[PDB]
């Protein structure tokens, strides 16, 4: 049979894994960046070697559409793929923030990830269905991309989309869109 375990400590590494935490898993293949899974259940086998029940986060590439324009570098999709893996497969814990708490980060580390979509793998479906769009390029926000906010419309714009490159945009003390100064 199997006992269910409250906590796992990885490799005496001062790191404690509990259900609900997000962790990284070594791929067998050398090239790949580590997989990112949410631990849902920890349990010890009959012979007392530990195993974990996993929900997978999908990278945009694994996903239906592939990486898109607005998909950030650390975009993940919570899947509905489940699995079970040896807990020796775990390397370190990582964090997968909500979109908003990601945007709030003082600065991003390899540790840090974010998710704004649940992705059904068999149907290829995405929840939610609607995205919010910005600028007059009218694209969804990509956190990697720098955006500036007019003080009139208080809409957000890409510097290039309004005809300035990034480092003058950094210089702007005050910004008003051209559409505010017209007609």
């Amino acid at each position: 049979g199997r006992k269910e375990l409250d906590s796992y400590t990885i490799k005496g590494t001062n790191k404690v894994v509990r259900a609900g935490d997000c962790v990284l898993m070594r791929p067998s293949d050398a090239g790949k960046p580590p997989y990112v899974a949410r631990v849902e259940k920890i349990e010890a086998d009959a012979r007392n070697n530990v195993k974990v029940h996993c929900r997978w986060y999908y990278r945009p590439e694994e996903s239906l559409g592939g990486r898109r324009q607005f998909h950030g570098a650390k975009e993940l999709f919570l899947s509905d793929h489940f699995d079970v893996q040896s807990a020796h497969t775990i390397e370190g814990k990582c964090i997968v923030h909500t979109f908003k708490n990601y945007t709030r980060l003082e600065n991003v580390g390899a540790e840090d990830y974010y998710c704004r979509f649940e992705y059904k793998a068999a149907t290829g479906a995405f929840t939610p269905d609607r995205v919010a769009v910005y600028c007059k390029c009218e694209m969804p926000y990509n956190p990697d991309d720098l955006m500036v906010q007019c003080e009139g419309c208080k809409d957000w714009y890409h510097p290039a989309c309004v005809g300035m490159t990034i480092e003058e945009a950094k210089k702007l003390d005050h910004f008003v869109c051209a559409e505010c100064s017209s007609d």
Binding site: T103, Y141, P143, D145, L146, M147, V148, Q149, C150, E151, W156, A169, K170, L172, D173, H174, F175
Partner: peptide, 5 residues
Amino acid sequence: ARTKQ
């Protein structure tokens, strides 16, 4: 102005 990162 206010920027987003």
